[model samples]
Structure formats: C-alpha cells, structure tokens
Target chain A: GSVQIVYKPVDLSKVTSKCGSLGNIHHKPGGGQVEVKSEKLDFKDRVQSKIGSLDNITH
Target chain B: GSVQIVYKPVDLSKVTSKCGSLGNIHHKPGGGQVEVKSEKLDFKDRVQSKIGSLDNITH
Candidate 1:
C-alpha cells in the first residue's frame, strides 16, 4: 500500500549501506528511472516498530 | 529513525509475491531488509509502548 497508496512512500532519508539498493540511485527530480530493489518494507525501528500488530503478515 | 536513521528506504532487487490474503503481488527482498516506505514519519509501527505521548497517532 505504501507505493500505490501514498504515491512516494519510499523515503530517500533512509540510509543505504548496500549496493544497487533503493535510493542508492535517483529518478531525476520530477520523474525518471529510479532503482528499487524489491525488498520487504524496513519497519523495524525508529521508523517502524511494534510490528507485532501486523496481523496481515504471516510466516 | 528509519531503521538506523541512515539512507535509502526500500530495495527492489528483491521479489514481489502475494501471501494467502495479502492480495495481489508484493515485492519482498533481503532477509534483513534495508529501507522503508511511508508518507508519515511515525506510522502505527513507530509508536513506542514504553511511554505516553499526546501527539501519538492511532489508527
């Protein structure tokens, strides 16, 4: 829902220590081809916490 | 604090798949992950159960 719902749900503020990672590249301001490594939403701390309530997610 | 308060918020090298009821397809990557996607700073996950804050957002 983040991508489709909020338009720009991906915040470039998140640090990227990996290569070819999201935000590691840019999409040229207004719009362009930005690299987005299909990965799970990093909601572990500071930004994402208490995910225990994520009834939608299952192992 | 997007995870470690670093950069990049969501990798796309991962893959997108749909769980039982998650609906449609979803991109998931990296076992540990390295990004985030959110329109707001403190989503439901950012809420800390340790203390009480007035500005606390609840949905």
Candidate 2:
C-alpha cells in the first residue's frame, strides 16, 4: 500500500473529534472492511517468508 | 480496514451494478489482499501460551 492508500493517514489524536473514536476502538455496522477472498490469491514460496508472507495454513 | 474502510457500504447491487464482477469461470492469484509487513511489527512471541485457543498449532 502507499500513503495514497488513503487521502492521508488518519491522525490518532484527532480521531475522536471526527466522530468515530470510541474514546476507544469500536466496530462500525459493516466493519467497514472489504474482504478479498484468498481463493483468488497465490502465496509465493520463499525461505525468508514467514506468516506475514505465507500463512502456515494453506488456503 | 473498516466499512469505514469504504466511505459507505457498497451495495453488491447490480455490481454489473457498478464494476468488476465475475462468475468464477476463470481464476487469478496474488498473496492475501492485505499484506502487513511484520519485520516492522512484532509477532506475539507469547502466542504459544494460548495454543489451546488455536485449532491445533503453535508458533
């Protein structure tokens, strides 16, 4: 991802002023997350690759 | 990511309705959609202490 992934990185200190800051993290109805199913993704094989690159559990 | 990840919940509606939609006759691959680099973050070294919580694996 890039800084362009978002207009700008959200400011942690000003989050509450925007409206959704829980004073703590809270879930929005849709989780606001888009899930890309890995059924379409291929894991690359590499020795240095760890959980971050390839899940130990195969898809 | 959030529903907040998207400005609003996208209505899968008519997704001919909007953009990319496929009926699965073809395939494609990549790593997972969100690849967080952990070398910059820390793996929970103590993840093993809660092994029972996982289906059946350990770090």
Candidate 3:
C-alpha cells in the first residue's frame, strides 16, 4: 500500500472562531482537517512545481 | 473557525503494497492518512523554523 501526505490550509468557512485571540480548530470535509489524498504524480509535481506559492500565506 | 494544513509522507508500515508500480493507497492510522489536529502556534512556528528539512526528501 502507498500513501500520500497532503498539505493545504484549513477552510475558513468550516472553521469556528471562538476566542478573539486564539480560535478553535476545524476539520476537513471528510471529518479531518488534513487534505491528504491518493497520490497523483501530477499533483505532487504540481505542488513541487509551484512550491513557493505557500510562502505568501505561511510567511 | 480556522484550520492548519498538514503535509507529511505516508507511513510505509500500515500500507499494503499491491502493485509494484503505483501501489494501493492507504489511510492514516485512525482511518484517514491526513493528520489534521488542533493547531498550536508553537507547532506552526516549529515547522516554519525547520522548513528546509522537507527539501532533502522531496528533492
């Protein structure tokens, strides 16, 4: 068996902001917050290709 | 509500290797392969600090 690790931001819509300072965590559509899925070579390549896109959000 | 995106490699152990080429996709221990958990500022900060580590395996 093989597995894929997904990395994506949580959807703000599904999330619930509790405290003004820190917020409560949310889960993904499938009941998990992570976006991991079946590995697609193209998808992995896409992520790697545009890799720096996350910088704007993360940094 | 808010979420944290998680990116990590699939665990090789729990996986069942079917076809030698692509192989079957496996789920994370509890069910999903994705590990979305409660967000912690410190954890996020830690990931940011060790950001370069992922390159070694991915590259």
Candidate 4:
C-alpha cells in the first residue's frame, strides 16, 4: 500500500517568537553559546521535519 | 469561489546540505558573519513562506 500524507501548518507566531529569541541570543556577546547551539540544533531539526512534511504533501 | 491548496515534498538533500553549511559557518570563529546573517535571514523568510503554504494546504 502507499502512504497517505497530510499537510498542516504549525503555529507561526510561536515559531517567529522562537526565531526572535534565537536571533537575540546569537547576537549577544559571548555566553549562552551552549544554550544557543542546542536551540539551533533543535530548530534545524524541526525545520527539516517541516520541509519533509511539505515535500511529502507536495510530491 | 474557493481556493485549493496542494502539498508536496521538497528536495530534502538540498535543504539538509544548506543547513549543514550554515551550521558549519555558525561554529566558525569570526568572519562570514555578514554572509551567515544574510543567509540565515533568507532561510527564515523561506521557512515562513513554507509555513504559510502548509497552513493554506492544511486549512
């Protein structure tokens, strides 16, 4: 059987806020490097998943 | 009348590679800040659009 994928949108406001926070932290001078890195990785993972979801739906 | 949204998958490998490059440049000490910042902004914008598209599709 073939897979049936559903496309859905996430909370854009939440994501925008998260991006804002990351940008602020990234611009800060020193410190929070570890925290920023962790968050960045997480963000990237989420983004990748989002892209995959979109691709499956679009394809 | 009504709008119809179609969802599809994107090229995961290209996105993954782009993320990899960004991560690498992010970890680097000094230089490429401007380039990284520009790319990051572009990436974020693309992400927002992607989310919007998904929202339209799923809604």
- Please compute the TM-score of chain B alone for each predicted structure, in the order given: 0.16, 0.14, 0.15, 0.16
Per-residue lDDT of candidate 3, residues A1-59 (tens digit): 33333453332222223333222322232334443333223211212232432333232
Query: Measured by TM-score, how close is model 4 to the native structure?
Result: 0.12
Superposed on all Cα atoms, model 2 deviates from the true structure by an RMSD in Å of 24.4
Q: What proportion of the real contacts between chains A and B does each prediction keep?
A: 0.04, 0.00, 0.08, 0.02
Report the lDDT tens digits of candidate 1 across residue range B1-59.
Answer: 23222343453332222332111222332233223333433223454553222343344
* Model 2 score (lDDT): 0.25
Residue-level lDDT tens digits of model 2 in A1-59: 32212222231211112222122222222223234221222344333322323225433
Off by over 4 Å in 2: A1-59, B1-4, B10-41, B44-59
lDDT of 4 by residue, A1-59 (tens): 12222333221111122221322112222332211111121123223223423322332
**Reference-based lDDT, residue B1, model 2:** 17
- lDDT (0 to 1) per candidate: 0.33, 0.25, 0.32, 0.24
Q: Candidate 3, overall lDDT?
A: 0.32
| Chain A TM-score of each candidate structure, as shown | 0.14, 0.14, 0.16, 0.16
lDDT of 1 by residue, A1-59 (tens): 33331224453222233333322222222323333342443454454333333223233
Looking at model 1, residue A52 earns an lDDT score of 37
Interface RMSD, candidate 2?
Answer: 24.4
TM-scores for all candidates: the values are: 0.13, 0.12, 0.13, 0.12
DockQ (CA atoms), all models: 0.04, 0.02, 0.04, 0.02
